[PDB]
């Protein structure tokens, strides 16, 4: 929520915000507040099986959300609807490319460096954005 670029700390303001590690078992867990048990009210000696029914259904709607519908758009999409980018005021992803950065090793050639190697990563790349129609004044931002 940082109001101004001055509410930003040393590292961030200069280098950009941090992002998430590539998804794996520990870097992409289930939202921490994930329900691990759903309690349902019971009388003292009886249980409304018809209620227990709704109970589950209700839980469902809750999980569906927790798991993958935390954003409004996702909820709507869930019903089989749509949402303009103007609906939840979201940047419009115009283009997204990616690649693996490879390179080569430089060999050591002097008395002590001979047999040593330094890696010089160095990958070329294109990032093309198809003609795009800009409906309203704004900004086209490209980040890496």
């Amino acid at each position: 929520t940082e109001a101004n670029p001055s509410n930003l700390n040393e590292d961030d303001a200069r280098y950009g915000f941090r992002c998430c590690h590539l998804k794996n078992i520990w870097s992409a867990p289930l939202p921490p507040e994930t329900k691990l048990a759903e309690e349902m009210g019971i009388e003292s000696n009886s249980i409304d099986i018809m209620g227990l029914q709704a109970a589950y259904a209700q839980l469902h709607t809750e999980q569906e959300r927790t798991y993958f519908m935390q954003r409004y758009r996702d909820v709507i999409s869930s019903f089989g609807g749509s949402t303009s980018y103007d609906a939840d005021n979201r940047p419009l992803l115009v283009m997204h490319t990616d690649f693996w950065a490879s390179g080569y090793d430089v060999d050591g050639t002097d008395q002590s460096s001979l047999g040593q190697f330094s890696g010089r990563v160095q990958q070329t790349f294109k990032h093309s954005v198809p003609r795009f129609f800009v409906p309203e004044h704004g900004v086209m931002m490209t980040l890496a």
């Binding site: 992002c19 998430c20 590539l22 992409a28 867990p29 935390q70 996702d74 693996w100």
Partner: peptide, 26 residues
């Protein structure tokens, strides 16, 4: 025995979904 000159390894990358986190995360 493969001829080529040693290449650095890339991505650890399939079937259906694995990571549910609430929505899209890059």
């Amino acid at each position: 025995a493969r001829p080529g000159r040693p290449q650095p390894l890339r991505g650890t990358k399939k079937g259906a979904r694995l990571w549910y986190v609430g929505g899209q995360q890059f």
